[PDB]
Each structure stands twice: as structure tokens, then as C-alpha cells.
Amino acid sequence: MLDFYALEDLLTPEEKEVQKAARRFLEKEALPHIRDWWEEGVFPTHLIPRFAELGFLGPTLPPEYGGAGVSSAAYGLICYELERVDSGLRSFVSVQSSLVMYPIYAYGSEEQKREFLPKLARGEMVGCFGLTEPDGGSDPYGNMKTRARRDTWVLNGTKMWITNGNLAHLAVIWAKDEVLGFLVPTDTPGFQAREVKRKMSLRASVTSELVLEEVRVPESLRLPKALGLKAPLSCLTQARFGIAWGAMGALEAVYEEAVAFAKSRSTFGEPLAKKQLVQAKLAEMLAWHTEGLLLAWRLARLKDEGKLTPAQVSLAKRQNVWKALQAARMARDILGGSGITLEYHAIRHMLNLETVYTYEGTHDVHTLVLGREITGLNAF
Amino acid sequence: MLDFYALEDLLTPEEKEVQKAARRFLEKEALPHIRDWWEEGVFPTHLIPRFAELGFLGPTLPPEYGGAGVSSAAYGLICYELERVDSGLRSFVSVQSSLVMYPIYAYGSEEQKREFLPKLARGEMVGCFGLTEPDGGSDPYGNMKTRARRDTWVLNGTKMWITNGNLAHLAVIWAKDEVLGFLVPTDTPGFQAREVKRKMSLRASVTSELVLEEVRVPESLRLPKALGLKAPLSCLTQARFGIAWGAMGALEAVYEEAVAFAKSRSTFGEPLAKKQLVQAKLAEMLAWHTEGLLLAWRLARLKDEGKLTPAQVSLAKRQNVWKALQAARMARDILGGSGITLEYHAIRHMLNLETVYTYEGTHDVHTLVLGREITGLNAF
Amino acid sequence: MLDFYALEDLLTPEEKEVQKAARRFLEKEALPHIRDWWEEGVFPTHLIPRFAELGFLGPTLPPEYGGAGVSSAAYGLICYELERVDSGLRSFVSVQSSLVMYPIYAYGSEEQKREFLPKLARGEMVGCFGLTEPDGGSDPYGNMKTRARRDTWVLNGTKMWITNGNLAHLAVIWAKDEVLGFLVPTDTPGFQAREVKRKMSLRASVTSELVLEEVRVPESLRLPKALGLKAPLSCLTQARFGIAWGAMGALEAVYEEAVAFAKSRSTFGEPLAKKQLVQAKLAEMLAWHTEGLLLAWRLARLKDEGKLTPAQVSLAKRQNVWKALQAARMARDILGGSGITLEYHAIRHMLNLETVYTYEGTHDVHTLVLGREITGLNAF
Amino acid sequence: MLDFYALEDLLTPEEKEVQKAARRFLEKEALPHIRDWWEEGVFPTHLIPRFAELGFLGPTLPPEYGGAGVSSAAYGLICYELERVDSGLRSFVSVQSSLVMYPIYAYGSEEQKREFLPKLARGEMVGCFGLTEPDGGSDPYGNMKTRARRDTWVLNGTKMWITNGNLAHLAVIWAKDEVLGFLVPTDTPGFQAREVKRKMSLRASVTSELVLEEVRVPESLRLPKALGLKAPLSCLTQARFGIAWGAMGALEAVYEEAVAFAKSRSTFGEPLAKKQLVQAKLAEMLAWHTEGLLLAWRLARLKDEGKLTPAQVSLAKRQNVWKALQAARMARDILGGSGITLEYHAIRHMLNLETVYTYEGTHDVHTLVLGREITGLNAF
Ligand SMILES: Cc1cc2nc3c(=O)[nH]c(=O)nc-3n(C[C@H](O)[C@H](O)[C@H](O)COP(=O)(O)OP(=O)(O)OC[C@H]3O[C@@H](n4cnc5c(N)ncnc54)[C@H](O)[C@@H]3O)c2cc1C
Ligand SMILES: Cc1cc2nc3c(=O)[nH]c(=O)nc-3n(C[C@H](O)[C@H](O)[C@H](O)COP(=O)(O)OP(=O)(O)OC[C@H]3O[C@@H](n4cnc5c(N)ncnc54)[C@H](O)[C@@H]3O)c2cc1C
Ligand SMILES: Cc1cc2nc3c(=O)[nH]c(=O)nc-3n(C[C@H](O)[C@H](O)[C@H](O)COP(=O)(O)OP(=O)(O)OC[C@H]3O[C@@H](n4cnc5c(N)ncnc54)[C@H](O)[C@@H]3O)c2cc1C
Ligand SMILES: Cc1cc2nc3c(=O)[nH]c(=O)nc-3n(C[C@H](O)[C@H](O)[C@H](O)COP(=O)(O)OP(=O)(O)OC[C@H]3O[C@@H](n4cnc5c(N)ncnc54)[C@H](O)[C@@H]3O)c2cc1C
């Protein structure tokens, strides 16, 4: 992996093998098809069982529930390699691991845990997280118009932009009565999932609109410990962690491609790579990558030692994704005409990162998170 | 049109009505479809006769040759309205007008002028401009390996990323023997035009690769006055002029849509338009637009009074396109998830502007143009 | 003057002569000493009678009043040349002309007007404008704790950072009872003016604090028409107009000194001026200079025709000062070690611009002004 | 320690203590006077023996030579606290430790090491590093016009901007015959050092001009192992290490002061600290500080394990100093009028950092360092 300040020297042998392993895998199995799957706008479902065979699904979870029980650094490292190929592939794992497996493990009943975690871990049953609604996801609580009225519940509302919306059997829905979380099977009557069309970003992924019309759900399917905005938020903190890592991976990809191109093309007689203005762009790309890996690494250790805070996560997601988005654009610029075609990746990552830059908290909401943490004043 | 500094007060009545009519035509005949066409990646050929009828083709040229004989400001103004819909539509007019109609008029023989200009002006025969080659369009003299050997000339070479490549009957090809310019019919044996596929930018336009294999061209088809790099460059200067204008139009498009969206959406209880962080973005968008129109307007007057220099044009193209590209990205950011779909224009303009940001001299070449201007030293 | 888009072509002969004369005067009489004056932190009072002679004091006001009765462009042009030497010299003229002369003229009694305007205009009785208070000048209405209770009015309050505080005989104090405008002689008992020391910025200018303790002022000394926040505010709009002009005077000053240094000094064998990264800083200081003059010029014409709006003024002050400050910083960067010494102006302007970047509305308040104007929503 | 990511957790008890101690003593002996010393532009020589007593002089050097033999992290930590007060105080320690102590230790004879290192360590004899010359410090090999002829050697040439130049007994002079290094006593006939006046940056520090006119130096005073450009460069790498740390310190200082001010001042009825635009600036400052500590930390560990490269150091110096300069400006902006006076530190740090941003390799030379390292091509 790209590593200027040798942070690998700080990884365990276990962490570095999952990295080596994730790369050989994705390099054999996904990378040769990424262009075509993005172009056609389709998510490669024959890869879910493979991710699963490699332990990409809920990696840090306990083997008891079918988890790989590896470190957070390792989870971050698989996200890194996944995103290095395409953010859509990384999105699937994030959702399944931190937005589905995670809440069940953290807030589910022992019944829910034994029942779902193993099938989710083995890519045998796919899930999706429904928090964002049409009035706007930056206000998670304020725009949550999905209701839940109670030994069975009846759900009514809508969710927008839900990843795995049409692939999932299980949908973690968040509604109000007070915020609660339900494990809603997608085939229970009154539940409809419709895919979003005309997507110019994160095409290698399924995004749906969820419509719950008088959907019936037993109390045995409501997350017992799931209480308040804090429950789904903790789920975003988890997801955001992997993303701060993946962002660095897509950055390696556009960077690597940019210097190769810069080095093979020439201009007023030197090589593109010899010009000061192109060198400055690459220098910036390298500097950002190095800064990003350290944030991600540091956050991985704090996470396992139980001292990681959401604001800390907000910082790394905000910074890393912003850098990756900027780097993707700079790379497309460097590629010139050749960069407007899916022949190079730079623009695929550039578009994909526009989404990553938006979901799991926009650049601005994270700014506010940090802002409030710094001043103690709420400016949202 | 968007006009914060009331520059319309500075336009003649004639110029102001080419603006009103252009928007009426495009608005009922092109904007309703631009989505679909960009989406399926097709250029609406049936609109070429409509542009011809409106006098969009080579607007400043003398009525003698079938031109509308209107002002540069008027040309800039039609480019403005064209780009505001889609850069691809503006590209066609730029090519036909400044990269084709212009070369023939400034460097053609009286025979070539009487023969082609009227057909081109009436959108009866479409042309293209072949300057850029596979090794790098930023050094157009240095990477020009297309050769021409002499009462007939045999041309051999390749051109990459040529607009109207597959629509053109006439191809203005630049080769060396010393730079010369030929009016090469596209059906003369040995001439092949293949379209570029997998385009994520400027999809509502045809881009081709030209391959000239032992193409014979009579001396009667070589541009007599066309001598040196200066000939094709003067064409770019003309083209760059209209682009500085169109850039401002696509800016009005994304800006207008952004404030509308900002005003209609809400979170933490006030409109998105009331937040300090989105008002700053809209404010930047407005500032840039005002700055851009003034540059464009100033250049239009200098142009008609014969005092416009290439360096001045480079400044306007560089500044305006950069600003429009930055504004398109800011708008997509403002639209959130809704901006990643072609349901909003923001991202279509965002992608298109990536191309405009590249062709007709990249951001960096213009910087060097200005740099050389300022210091007298060549740093390319 | 520096004029890459030949805007001097848009100037009348009179407006062009006031500019030539202004530069000749300042070059011979102020530039040679600005370094020592800014150093010892003193404002050259002997220059006040000279400004008067040249007609710098209240230039647009009617000759009946001792005014030069020239255009707004001309006022903008003298500001330009003044700032090109030092912001402190321009500040004196803005205060005297737009913050003192103006309100008396716009809202004064006929007695106040015939009395005060000619003396102020021959540089015979120098004024100041006391609006800002210790709690925050961005909320001029909110933070206005100075009281006025009534045929005489007793005033109590404090004013911070008042230019000409210790030079003024007349002090335009703004207070509440609804905002009223006064015109307090500085010698009327209970009125104290203390200079601010340890100033790093705008050292060639006197800044004071005004303490009004039970100050008695006849109603004959109150601005009859000065009603509401709108009155002291319109005075800021006038001043901000010449500031937008002056900013592009100091930018000509830093840009010019830097291209000269860049062409004169040199590294790995070429000159500084020839490296891509120095060329780029200069291109940017040229691009902004051009954008700024057009904004300033356009505003000057709208002003004389009664079409100028405050939001319009907010835009050019905001853009031009930010550009001139970034340009000053970029220039100090270009000068290297040599730029940290007053031997080069770059840093003196860099420090001064910091103040103009703050007074007469900070960068952010102007952003909010534009924001409210665009959305119709107040976000201050 | 401002420490958002709890990096103090990565520090040994010893390192932690050198930090606590450093802050306690500079807090009592330096902070209360810094404002004044900077003002009158004087370096507090009386603090030199104090620094020595705390072990600030050549902290990582072996106790055998009078060194504290502590870690690089610890050296970085003292630099941090020193700069947090003022860059000029940190500069003295950098010069003495990495630009004077270091070269003697790394390239000196056993006689030079035993003779000088203990007196330097005890602040009993102050040194200065003379590399930069009047034609340009960025090309130190190319602009090194100082010559040394041959056992005495006679030196003649001139050096610019040399910190401690007037405070020193020994001057390390780099000259050509190839690059050689000499330990020139400052009282040897033919050597003169006059100060640089009119400094508006790093005023709490002595900067001199060194003039060597036919200066005689024995071969016993030439650094034996000192060969080539590399020798003096290794010295800068060392110095740049501590600076990447110090930068973080001044950042904490302006940041801390900014939020305090933002919290205590209010506007349209909120505190400044509750505005989205001011929160964003602080958020950025906090993000930069967190990124900067990690870079500094990692570099410290790599350094002690003998794995640190110059390019890695270039990255950290360029990034951290640039961020600290940016943050200082963003703080002055936040302070408003109150920020232009030495009452607030913000502007003193802003001015000091302009120097740090320039010496020990400018922002641009570091960019080129990284550039060359990434592409393998030299663009200087
Ligand atoms: C491809 C894709 C996949 C997604 N998958 C999921 C998923 O699986 N699960 C899920 O729950 N959600 C998902 N989302 C939703 C995503 O999290 C939202 O798009 C995100 O919350 C942005 O919110 P919004 O689109 O409703 O826009 P808004 O929240 O309306 O935001 C629009 C613009 O306003 C700005 N803004 C909003 N509030 C403020 C404020 N208070 N102050 C200043 N600025 C503000 C934002 O920064 C943004 O710039 C997905 C989105 C996309 C595009
Ligand atoms: C949609 C589209 C349509 C087009 N249509 C036409 C057309 O109709 N006719 C035509 O002739 N051409 C056309 N082009 C070509 C276009 O002008 C080129 O893409 C442009 O010149 C960029 O050159 P390049 O792609 O060869 O990349 P390069 O020239 O290799 O540039 C690549 C990267 O290097 C940078 N660079 C290059 N030289 C230097 C230097 N000396 N110093 C510092 N940086 C440097 C550039 O800034 C750019 O960032 C079109 C391109 C596109 C994408
Ligand atoms: C050299 C000098 C000369 C001056 N001369 C005069 C004079 O002659 N007459 C006169 O009346 N005044 C004068 N001033 C005052 C000047 O106009 C004020 O400094 C200015 O209003 C800034 O306000 P403040 O210093 O009170 O800081 P504040 O108003 O407290 O502002 C501090 C920081 O907060 C930000 N802020 C404030 N409100 C908001 C908000 N609602 N939303 C987001 N951000 C906000 C500001 O942008 C600024 O960044 C002078 C100042 C200086 C430095
Ligand atoms: C307060 C202070 C203390 C100092 N103390 C010392 C000391 O103790 N010892 C010592 O040896 N030196 C010292 N210096 C010198 C310092 O290292 C130089 O100022 C620095 O090398 C900048 O070089 P210069 O001033 O000669 O400007 P130049 O090298 O001429 O640089 C000027 C501008 O050109 C740019 N530039 C230069 N070369 C290139 C290139 N090839 N490509 C693109 N851009 C380029 C630079 O980036 C800079 O922006 C000190 C300087 C200051 C201001």
C-alpha cells in the first residue's frame, strides 16, 4: 500500500495479512470488472458471498456470532482496499457491518443476535439502514417523520437514498412514537422498496426509496436497547470510521494513476511529471494521504481501547473524504481529455466520492460537530 | 438573465434581443430534452438547422458570406444562453463559428470563402477542427506529428478528441511539412473518423478520433493565408472568447437551481437558505458571476474595436471556466443526495465543465500564457 | 496605472487627470516617507492641507460647499492612488469625505452644512465617525450602548477604534434615545479621546477611543435628517466604494514590486519570474486586479446615476479587499526573507489590508449582506 | 497540550515531564514579557543560561558532551512550548541545537566536539549558522559565492539573514573551494556582523549580515567529515524537525485565544462562538492542529529509530508551518479590530510565522522536494 510515513510499521502481522489478502482478492475479482459494473450501474451480488468468505462482513464482531473478531485497524484496512477499487463495493460492507450487523449486536436481543448475525456474517442475508428521509438527512431527528405506534407495532413513513434497499431482507428502520429501531423484514406486507434511477454517482451500488405503509412488526423485532437518536448515530460513527479509511484507499488509486500518467506523457520537452504545477498537485495528494492514514490509524487504536469519541470520528471522516474528493478532481485535471472517460478511474472515483462527501454526515455537519465540541455551543 | 451589476444597461437593443430570443428557442426546444440526450450520450443534430435559422452560426461574420453580422457581445450572448442549457450545445456553435467558419474567413481563398461559409452558416454542412493529437494538446506545435508533403498534398497523422468528428463533411486539419491548414473533406479516401466512447463529460456532443492515412488534398483546399502556429491559435482565441461567455451561463443555471433548492428545503428548523454556510456558497457564486460578466463584456467591446489580445482572452477563459466549475461542484454539494442524479442539472454541468476546463487551453496553460505575458519569460 | 483590460478607456479626460495629478503629488510628497511614518506610527498631518488643495476632501460634493464636484469614478481614482501608497492615507480621506462630509451633506441642517462642509473640505477642520463600540462593531445597532437624552442632549457612551479620534474637532457620534446622529465638538466638556497604541496595522493613521461622559450638545448640533440605522449605514456604503477602489491600488503596489523582484533575483539558473510556481502567483494578482477595477468602475457609474445599491457596494468591498490582502500575502511570500522588512512595502500593505479587511464591515458581514439579499432571509 | 486525539498517550513519562516543565518555566519567565521584547525588537539573552539549565540546548545529544540525551519527541516538545510563546525563542534553540551543536557532533573532530559542545550545551558560548547568501537561499549550492582557499584557509564571501549573527562567538560558515564547513570564531580579524533592522517579523531574535573579508581559519577549525551540500542540509533537516513541532505550539496559542475571544464577545444576540462562520474557522484550526501533532509525532519516532528521511521532514515542515500561518491569519480575522494590536499575540504569531514559512526551505522548495521524490524528476 501507499505509505510515506511507514505507518505499516505500526500494524500487527495480523493486520497486514488481511490487507495483503484483501488486495489480492479484489485485484483478482473485482478490479477487472469495476468499469463495466459502474457503467451499467449494477452492484455485483456474486461478490457478497466472497466478501463473506473472506470475513469482510462484520470483521470486528465476535466469532461467536460468526464474526472474524479482528481489530478495527483490520476493518479499516479492508475498507481501504475495497474503496481503492470502488466506493460502492466499500459501501456494501460498511452498511452490512456498521449499519446492520453493528446495531443488532449492540442493541439487539440475544434472540435477534443469534438469529441474524450469523446469516449476515455469511452474506446469506443482506440488510439496509433506513434513517434518512426526504426532508433531509442532516437533521436526523427533526426530519424523522416515520411513525411507530404500539404487542406489535405499526410503522408508517418513508426513507430516501437507502443503500441495499432492494437487496435486503432486513431493513433497520428508525421511527418515532422518542427514537426506536426496528428489524423490519422487507417482505412483510405494506413495505415497498423502489430503486433510485439516473444516478451519476455510486452506480456500482443499489440505492432505494423505502415506503412503509401500515407495516406490522412484532415487539420481538424491535431493538430492545435501541433508545434515542444516539442509537442510530452510534451506527454512523462506526460506519464513518471505515469510511475515513476507505477514502485513503481511493486516494492511493487516483494518485498512483496520476503520477504514472504524468510520467508517461510529455510536453514542451520534458515529461508532464517534470512540470512544477503538476508536481505540486501530486505533492499535495501525497501529503494528504499521509495525513489521512495517521488519522485513520490513530482512530483505529483509540477505537479498540474504547476511548474513541464521535467528534474524533467526525474529524477523520470530514478531512479524509474532503481530501480524497479534492485529489480525485486534481487527478482528472491532470489526465486532461483522457480523464473524462471511464478508461481511467479518476473520474469514477471523483463522482463516487461526491456521494461519500455527502452521506454519513455532510462536510458541513461534521464541521458543526467539531464546532459544537470546541465551543460547547450548538450552531446547527 | 442573471445580472447583479446591471450590465444589460450596457448592451445595445439588438444584443439584448438576441439574448431574449435565444433563451425562448432553447427553452422550449432544447432544455426539455437535454437530460435524456446527455444521458443517452447523443447530440441533437436536428437542432443544427434551428441554430442556423436563429443565426447562431458564425454570428459575427458578414452577411455577404451568409453571416448575421452582429456584434461580438451578441455572439458571447448566444454562447451564454447555449451553455446555460448544456456546454455540448455551445461547443457545436463554438466549433462551427470560431474553429471552422473563422479559419475559412481569415485564412481562406475567396473561392473557399464563397464555397463553404454560406453552407456552414446555414448549418447545411458541418465542420470540425483538428489540432490536438495523442501526445498532448497543451503543446500543439510540439506534438503535431501529422505531416503534409506536396499540386496536391498527402496528409498522414492522427487527431484526438475532435468535436463534430463524425458529423463533419469538412475537417480543418493542421499538419506540418511549418504549420499549415487544410480544408479536408471527410469522405476523401484515407480519412477515418471514429467516435470516442465511455464519455462521462460533454455527452451531448460528438467527439471523435481522426485518422488520416495518405489523404490527398489539392492545393486549392489548403488555407492560403494560414501560416504558422499563430493561425490555429487565433482560432482558439476566437473560440475562447465565446467560452468565457458561456461559462457564465452554466453558472447562472447551477446558481439559480441552488438558491431555489436552498429556499425550499429545511433542517433544524429554518430553511437551508438561512444557514450561514450555504449563504456563503451562494454569495461566492453570485460574486463570481458578476466578475465573469464584466470580463466577458469588456473583452467583447475590445474585440469589436480591434484591441483584443490573446493574453486578455486567456485571462477570461481561465477565470470564468474555473469559477463555473467550482460553482457547479458547490451546487452539487448544496443539493446533497439529490445532486447525484440527472434530475438536477448541477452534476451534468459539473461534469461538462470538467471538459471546458480542459480543452481550448487548460487552466495551467493559460496561467503560463499570463505568466509569460507578465514576465516576458517562457515557462511552458 | 496598472490596467490590463484598458479600463482607462472608459474614463473621462477629467477623471483621468485627477488620477495623473494624484499620483504625481503622492509620489513626490508621500511615498518617499511612508516607510518612516508607518514605522514610527505617525500620521502626516501636514499632508491634510495638501489633500485639501488637490481636492481630495469631499471630491464629489458640490462646489457651493467647498467641494470639487467631480465624479464618483474620480473619487474612486484618488482613493486608488492614495491606497497605492498606504491605506492610512486613504483612510483619512474616506473618513473626511464619506463618514464626515457625507452625513453632514445628506442629513445636515443648512446651518450645519454651510458651516462645516467648506472648512472640512479645505482641510481646515478634520472630522471623525464614531459608530463602533467595545461590544462588537458588526452589530452596529445591537451593540450601540451610547445614550442620548433630551433643547440640549446629554450623551454618554464609548466608541472604540475611531479613526482621526485625536485629530478631530468634530465627532459624528451615533447614539440611541432609535438611532440619532450628532456632531459633537471634541472640546465640549465630558468628551475624551485617547489614542490606541501597540498597533501592528494601519500605523500611519490615528485611532482613538472616545469616552463621552455627560457630554452636552445643542439640538442645533444634531443631524436633523439622520434617522435610523440606515443613515450611518449609507455613510459606510459611500466609504466602501472608494475602499473597493483603493484596494486595487495597493494590489498594483505589491504586484509591481514582486514582478520586479522576481525578474531581478534568481535560482537554479533561471530567474524567479520564469518558474511556474512564481508565474502562477503573479497571474493571480493580475487576474484579481482586472476583476476589481471592473467592479469598482461599474459601481462608480451606477453611483452617479443613482442606481447603486448597498448590497452592490458590499460585493466589491468584500471581493477587492480579500484579493488585495491575499495578493499582499502572496507577494510577501514571493519576496522571501527580504519581505519581512519594511524595506519592501509588501508587508506594510499586508498588515494595513488586514484592517480594511476588518473595518467598514468584515468579510463575513458582507457575505451575510449578500446572503440576505439573495435569499431574503436574515442569517446574521 | 491542546490534544484532541490524545497523542500525549503516545508519550513516555520522561517526554511528558519535559513538556510540563518547559511550559511552567517559559510561562513564568517568558510569556509575561514577550509582548514587550517583540515590541522593542530585542532577544532576551538572559534566558539563554536558563534554557541551558533546563536542557533546551542540544537536548538529544549525549550527556558525554554536555547533552541531556533525551528523545527527539522531547526536543520536539520543547520546541512546541517555546514557539507557543514566540517563534524567536524557539529559533534560538533550533540554531544552537540543530544548526550549531549538531554539525559539530556529526561532522566535527573529537577535538572540536570536546572543545565546543559542552560550552554550547551550557549556553556559555552561542553559535550561528551561515548558509544563506544575498542571491537566494533556495539555491544554496548555486548561490554560495563564499570562497575558502588553502594550513590556514582564507574565507571571503557574504552571508545574509543569519540568526544569532550578532550574539555569536563561533559561526558555522559553509563555503566552496566543493562545499566545506568551518568553525569561524567571530572575533577573528576580517569578519563582521551588523544587524538587520526594520524587521516586522521575528523581532524577538537577532538577525545579522555576515561579512567575511580575508578571514583566516586553521584546518583544525574546519569540520573534517563535513563534505558537500549534504552536510549543511542534514543540519536543516534536524532544524526543520523541531520547527514542525513548534508550529503546532504557536497554533495552540492563537487557537486558544481565538475561542476564548469568540466565547466572550457577542453580536446579533448570540455569542460570536455560536456563528457558523466563526465555528468553521475554529474547526479548521483544531483539525489542522490534530493533523500536525500526528505528523510531528510519527517523525519523532522514525527519527530515533534511524528511519527518518529528509523528504519526510520536508512534508511536516511545509504542512505544519503553512497551517499555523493560515490559522494565525484566521485568528486575527476573528479578533477584528482587537487583533491589530500587540495586546493579542495573534498578530505577533502571524508575523513571526511569515518568517518560519520562509526560512529552512520555503513552502515551494519543500513542494519541489516532495515533487522530486514522487516523480524522480528535478523541477527546481
Ligand atoms: C448514494 C447515497 C447513498 C445513501 N445511503 C444512505 C443509507 O444507506 N442510509 C441512510 O440513512 N442515508 C443514506 N443516504 C442519505 C445521506 O446520508 C443524505 O444524502 C445526507 O444526509 C444528506 O442529506 P440530504 O440529501 O437530505 O440533504 P440536506 O440534509 O438537505 O443537505 C443539503 C445541503 O445543506 C447543508 N446543511 C444541511 N443542514 C445544515 C445546517 N444545519 N447548517 C448548515 N448547512 C446545512 C448540507 O451540508 C448539504 O450541504 C444516502 C445518500 C446517497 C447520495
Ligand atoms: C470533450 C473534448 C473535446 C475536445 N475537442 C477538441 C477539438 O474539437 N479540437 C481540438 O483540437 N482539440 C479538442 N480537444 C482537445 C483538448 O484541447 C485537449 O484535451 C487539451 O489540450 C488537453 O490536452 P491533453 O488531453 O492532450 O493533455 P495534456 O496536454 O497531456 O495535459 C495534461 C495535464 O498536464 C498539464 N500540462 C500540460 N503541459 C504543461 C506544462 N507545460 N506545464 C505545466 N503543466 C502542463 C495540463 O495542464 C493538464 O493538466 C477536446 C478535448 C475534450 C476532452
Ligand atoms: C484601524 C481600525 C480603524 C477603525 N476605524 C473606525 C471608524 O473610524 N469608525 C467606526 O465606526 N469604526 C471603526 N473601526 C471599527 C471596525 O469597523 C471594527 O473593527 C469592525 O466592525 C469589526 O468589529 P469588532 O472589532 O467589534 O469585532 P466583532 O464585530 O466582535 O467581530 C469579530 C469576529 O466575528 C465575526 N462576526 C461578527 N458578527 C458575526 C455574525 N453575525 N455572523 C458571523 N460572524 C460574525 C466578524 O466577522 C469578525 O470575524 C476601526 C477598526 C480598526 C481595526
Ligand atoms: C528571520 C530570518 C532568519 C533567517 N535565519 C537564517 C539562518 O540562521 N541561517 C541561514 O542559512 N539562513 C537564514 N535565513 C535565510 C532563509 O533561509 C531564506 O530567507 C530563505 O532561503 C528564502 O530565500 P531568499 O530570502 O534568498 O529568497 P529566494 O530564495 O530568492 O526566494 C524568493 C521567492 O522564490 C521562490 N523560489 C526560489 N527558488 C524557486 C524555484 N526553484 N522554483 C520556484 N520558486 C522558487 C521561493 O519559494 C520564494 O517564494 C533567515 C531568513 C529570515 C527571514
CSV table of C-alpha atoms in Angstrom, one decimal, chain B residues 214-343:
chain,number,residue,atom,x,y,z
B,214,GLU,CA,-2.2,9.0,-47.1
B,215,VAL,CA,-5.1,11.5,-47.5
B,216,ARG,CA,-4.7,13.6,-50.7
B,217,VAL,CA,-5.8,17.2,-50.7
B,218,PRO,CA,-5.5,19.7,-53.6
B,219,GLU,CA,-3.6,23.0,-53.0
B,220,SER,CA,-6.9,24.7,-53.8
B,221,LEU,CA,-8.1,23.2,-50.4
B,222,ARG,CA,-5.2,24.4,-48.3
B,223,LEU,CA,-5.8,27.7,-46.4
B,224,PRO,CA,-3.6,30.2,-48.3
B,225,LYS,CA,-3.1,32.8,-45.5
B,226,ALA,CA,-2.9,30.0,-42.8
B,227,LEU,CA,0.8,30.2,-41.8
B,228,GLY,CA,2.3,29.1,-38.5
B,229,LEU,CA,1.1,28.1,-35.1
B,230,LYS,CA,-0.5,31.5,-35.0
B,231,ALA,CA,-3.2,30.5,-37.4
B,232,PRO,CA,-4.8,27.7,-35.3
B,233,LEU,CA,-4.1,29.7,-32.2
B,234,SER,CA,-6.1,32.7,-33.4
B,235,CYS,CA,-9.0,30.2,-33.9
B,236,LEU,CA,-8.7,29.2,-30.3
B,237,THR,CA,-8.6,32.8,-29.1
B,238,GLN,CA,-11.9,33.3,-31.0
B,239,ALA,CA,-13.4,30.1,-29.5
B,240,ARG,CA,-12.1,31.0,-26.0
B,241,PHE,CA,-14.0,34.3,-26.3
B,242,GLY,CA,-17.4,32.7,-26.6
B,243,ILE,CA,-16.5,30.2,-23.9
B,244,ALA,CA,-15.7,32.9,-21.4
B,245,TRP,CA,-19.3,33.9,-22.0
B,246,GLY,CA,-21.0,30.5,-22.0
B,247,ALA,CA,-19.2,29.7,-18.7
B,248,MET,CA,-21.2,32.5,-17.1
B,249,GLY,CA,-24.4,30.9,-18.4
B,250,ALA,CA,-23.9,27.5,-16.9
B,251,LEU,CA,-23.1,29.4,-13.7
B,252,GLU,CA,-26.4,31.1,-13.8
B,253,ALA,CA,-28.0,27.7,-14.3
B,254,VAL,CA,-26.4,26.0,-11.3
B,255,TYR,CA,-26.7,29.1,-9.1
B,256,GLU,CA,-30.4,29.6,-9.9
B,257,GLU,CA,-31.2,26.0,-9.1
B,258,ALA,CA,-29.1,26.1,-5.9
B,259,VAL,CA,-30.9,29.0,-4.3
B,260,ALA,CA,-34.3,27.6,-5.3
B,261,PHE,CA,-33.3,24.3,-3.7
B,262,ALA,CA,-31.9,26.1,-0.6
B,263,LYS,CA,-35.0,28.1,-0.2
B,264,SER,CA,-37.4,25.1,-0.4
B,265,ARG,CA,-35.5,22.7,1.9
B,266,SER,CA,-35.3,22.9,5.7
B,267,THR,CA,-33.4,21.4,8.8
B,268,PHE,CA,-33.2,22.4,12.5
B,269,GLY,CA,-36.0,24.5,11.6
B,270,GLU,CA,-35.1,27.2,9.3
B,271,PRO,CA,-34.6,27.0,5.5
B,272,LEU,CA,-31.4,25.7,4.1
B,273,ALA,CA,-31.2,29.2,2.5
B,274,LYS,CA,-30.9,30.8,6.0
B,275,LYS,CA,-27.8,28.9,7.1
B,276,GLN,CA,-24.5,30.9,7.1
B,277,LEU,CA,-22.6,28.1,5.5
B,278,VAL,CA,-24.9,27.8,2.4
B,279,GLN,CA,-25.5,31.5,2.1
B,280,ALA,CA,-21.6,31.9,1.8
B,281,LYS,CA,-21.7,29.5,-1.1
B,282,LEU,CA,-24.5,31.2,-2.9
B,283,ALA,CA,-22.7,34.6,-2.2
B,284,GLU,CA,-19.5,33.3,-3.8
B,285,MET,CA,-21.5,32.0,-6.8
B,286,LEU,CA,-23.0,35.5,-7.3
B,287,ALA,CA,-19.7,37.3,-6.9
B,288,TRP,CA,-18.0,35.1,-9.5
B,289,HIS,CA,-20.8,35.5,-11.9
B,290,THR,CA,-20.7,39.3,-11.7
B,291,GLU,CA,-16.9,39.3,-12.1
B,292,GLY,CA,-17.2,37.0,-15.1
B,293,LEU,CA,-19.8,39.0,-17.0
B,294,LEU,CA,-17.7,42.1,-16.7
B,295,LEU,CA,-14.6,40.4,-18.0
B,296,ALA,CA,-16.7,39.0,-20.9
B,297,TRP,CA,-18.4,42.3,-21.6
B,298,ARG,CA,-15.1,44.2,-21.6
B,299,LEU,CA,-13.5,41.7,-23.9
B,300,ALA,CA,-16.5,41.9,-26.3
B,301,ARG,CA,-16.0,45.6,-26.8
B,302,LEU,CA,-12.2,45.4,-27.1
B,303,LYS,CA,-12.8,42.6,-29.7
B,304,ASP,CA,-15.0,44.7,-32.0
B,305,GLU,CA,-12.7,47.7,-31.7
B,306,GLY,CA,-9.8,45.5,-32.8
B,307,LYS,CA,-7.9,45.8,-29.5
B,308,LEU,CA,-8.4,42.3,-28.1
B,309,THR,CA,-5.2,40.4,-27.4
B,310,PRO,CA,-4.9,36.6,-26.8
B,311,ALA,CA,-3.5,37.1,-23.3
B,312,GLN,CA,-6.6,39.0,-22.4
B,313,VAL,CA,-8.8,36.2,-23.7
B,314,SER,CA,-6.7,33.6,-21.8
B,315,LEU,CA,-7.4,35.5,-18.6
B,316,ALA,CA,-11.2,35.5,-19.2
B,317,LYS,CA,-11.4,31.8,-20.2
B,318,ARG,CA,-9.2,30.7,-17.3
B,319,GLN,CA,-11.1,32.7,-14.7
B,320,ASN,CA,-14.6,32.2,-15.9
B,321,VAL,CA,-14.4,28.4,-16.5
B,322,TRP,CA,-12.6,27.8,-13.2
B,323,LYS,CA,-15.3,29.7,-11.4
B,324,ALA,CA,-18.1,27.9,-13.2
B,325,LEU,CA,-16.5,24.6,-12.4
B,326,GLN,CA,-16.1,25.5,-8.8
B,327,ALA,CA,-19.7,26.7,-8.6
B,328,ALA,CA,-21.0,23.6,-10.2
B,329,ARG,CA,-19.3,21.5,-7.5
B,330,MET,CA,-20.5,23.8,-4.7
B,331,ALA,CA,-24.1,23.5,-6.0
B,332,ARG,CA,-23.9,19.7,-6.2
B,333,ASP,CA,-22.7,19.9,-2.6
B,334,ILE,CA,-25.7,22.1,-1.7
B,335,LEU,CA,-28.1,19.6,-3.4
B,336,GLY,CA,-26.9,16.7,-1.2
B,337,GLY,CA,-28.1,13.3,-2.3
B,338,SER,CA,-30.5,14.9,-4.8
B,339,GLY,CA,-27.5,16.3,-6.7
B,340,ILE,CA,-26.0,12.9,-7.8
B,341,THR,CA,-28.9,12.3,-10.2
B,342,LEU,CA,-29.5,13.9,-13.6
B,343,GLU,CA,-32.8,15.1,-12.1
